[PDB]
Design an enzyme around this catalytic site. Structure first.
Site, PDB file in Angstrom:
ATOM      1  N   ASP A 116      82.470   5.193 -79.315  1.00 48.29           N
ATOM      2  CA  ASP A 116      82.619   4.814 -77.923  1.00 48.29           C
ATOM      3  C   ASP A 116      82.772   3.300 -77.823  1.00 48.29           C
ATOM      4  OD1 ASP A 116      82.079   4.174 -75.168  1.00 48.29           O
ATOM      5  OD2 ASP A 116      81.145   6.141 -74.975  1.00 48.29           O
ATOM      6  N   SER A 173      79.917   9.317 -67.943  1.00 50.34           N
ATOM      7  CA  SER A 173      79.730   7.867 -67.849  1.00 50.34           C
ATOM      8  C   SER A 173      78.906   7.548 -66.613  1.00 50.34           C
ATOM      9  CB  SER A 173      81.097   7.180 -67.936  1.00 50.34           C
ATOM     10  OG  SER A 173      80.922   5.829 -68.334  1.00 50.34           O
ATOM     11  N   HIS A 226      85.164   7.264 -75.533  1.00 48.07           N
ATOM     12  CA  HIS A 226      84.512   7.475 -74.249  1.00 48.07           C
ATOM     13  C   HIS A 226      84.929   8.791 -73.595  1.00 48.07           C
ATOM     14  CE1 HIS A 226      81.763   5.734 -71.403  1.00 48.07           C
ATOM     15  NE2 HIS A 226      82.628   5.763 -70.405  1.00 48.07           N
TER      16      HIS A 226
END
Length: 184
Positions: free
Chosen positions: A136, A73, A163
């Protein structure tokens, strides 16, 4: 030849030793005799400012041409920006994207203020693997696909990983051990 791995986590205040899969992946990689997987709590963990994370990656995480960087991320974004100006052995991106997603906290990071230097990243890192999932809840697939196209990543596309917040991540271990050239 790769000497170590480094995990750059997502943003947020979670301890890197217990948030999602970071601690599990570190423990699994360090089962290789003599192998270090660095994972440290990041300074400025909430905003994840480029001006703070990239120096930390260089000075405290020692990310260099023998490092496999695993970025999740915000840490995937940081790893990509880092590789614009640093030679890196290999990068494994988890849940990567290209814009601030319209979110002010993403925007505050400073990662999304100028064009991506895709060609420089590829010249500085010939080995780029990418994990992404179509479910996600934070990232549209288009942004993950843009990374895969612009960087010509080895894309591991899933449909049910969100995620990538689960606590174990065996597919990532296999990828990292491949990059380390550990024989079967």
């Amino acid at each position: 030849s790769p000497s170590k791995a480094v995990i750059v986590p997502g943003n947020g205040g979670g301890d890197v030793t217990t948030h999602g899969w970071y601690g599990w992946v570190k423990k699994e990689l360090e089962k290789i005799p003599g192998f270090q997987c660095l994972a440290k709590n990041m300074p400025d963990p909430i905003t994840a400012r480029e001006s703070i994370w990239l120096p930390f990656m260089e000075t405290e995480l020692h990310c260099d041409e023998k490092t496999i960087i695993i970025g999740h991320s915000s840490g995937a974004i940081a790893a990509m920006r880092y590789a614009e100006t640093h030679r890196v052995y290999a990068i494994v991106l988890v849940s990567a994207y290209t814009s601030d997603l319209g979110d002010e906290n993403e925007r505050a990071s400073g990662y999304f203020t100028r064009p991506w230097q895709w060609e420089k990243i590829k010249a500085n890192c010939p080995y780029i693997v990418q994990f992404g999932s179509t479910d996600d809840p934070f990232l549209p697939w288009k942004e993950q696909q843009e990374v895969a196209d612009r960087l010509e990543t080895k894309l591991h596309k899933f449909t049910d990983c969100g995620h990538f917040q689960n606590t174990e991540f065996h597919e990532l271990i296999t990828v990292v051990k491949s990059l380390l050239k550990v024989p079967a």
